Amino acid sequence: LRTVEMKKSLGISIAGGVGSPLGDVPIFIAMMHPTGVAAQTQKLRVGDRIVTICGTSTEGMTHTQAVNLLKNASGSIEMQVVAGGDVSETSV
């Protein structure tokens, strides 16, 4: 579990959520802009699953809900993540 505080775009591409094309899966980081704010933290990784955003659980969030929250936010944006662990995919 890692907790990150970012100030803004965040420079991440998020995927997953309730009702995703693969069913209800945790929100996750699918890509990251190489020079963006997320990259600059050196604490987020592609494949991280997002457990909380702006101090609230992602349990039950759809992809649209999570994206709208992140797009709308400014100031300090808290995120907590867990590593994907190569559990549901494999890094090559």
Curated annotation (Swiss-Prot):
Can you say where in the cell this protein is located?
Cell membrane; Apical cell membrane; Postsynaptic density; Cell projection, Dendrite
Any idea where the PDZ domain is?
3-85
Show the coiled coil region(s).
none
- The organism's superkingdom is given as Eukaryota
Q: In which tissues is it expressed?
A: Expressed in heart, brain, placenta, liver, skeletal muscle, kidney and pancreas.
Q: What assembly does the database describe for this protein?
A: Interacts with CLDN5, DLG4, GRIN1, F11R/JAM, CLDN1, NG2, CRB1, MPP4 and PALS1. Interacts with HTR2A, HTR2B, HTR2C, PLEKHA1/TAPP1, PLEKHA2/TAPP2, CXADR, SYNGAP1, CAMK2A and CAMK2B. Interacts with FAT4 (via cytoplasmic domain). Interacts with DLL1. (Microbial infection) Interacts with human adenovirus type 9 E4-ORF1 protein.
Q: Which disease is it linked to?
A: Hydrocephalus, congenital, 2, with or without brain or eye anomalies: A form of congenital hydrocephalus, a disease characterized by onset in utero of enlarged ventricles due to accumulation of ventricular cerebrospinal fluid. HYC2 affected individuals have variable neurologic impairment. Some individuals have other brain abnormalities, including lissencephaly, thinning of the corpus callosum, and neuronal heterotopia. Most patients have delayed motor development and some have delayed intellectual development and/or seizures.
Protein purpose:
Member of the NMDAR signaling complex that may play a role in control of AMPAR potentiation and synaptic plasticity in excitatory synapses. Promotes clustering of HT2RC at the cell surface.
About its domains, the entry says:
The PDZ domain 1 binds NG2. The PDZ domains 7 and 10 bind the Ad9 E4-ORF1 oncoprotein. The PDZ domain 9 binds F11R. The PDZ domain 10 binds the C-terminus of CLDN1 and KIT and the C-terminal PDZ-binding motif of HTR2C. The PDZ domain 13 binds CXADR. The PDZ domain 2 binds CAMK2A and CAMK2B. The PDZ domains 10 and 13 bind PLEKHA1 and PLEKHA2. The PDZ domain 13 binds SYNGAP1.
Q: This protein is called what?
A: Multiple PDZ domain protein
Originating organism: Homo sapiens (Human)
Q: Which gene encodes it?
A: MPDZ
> Which stretch of the intact protein is present?
1860 to 1951 of 2070
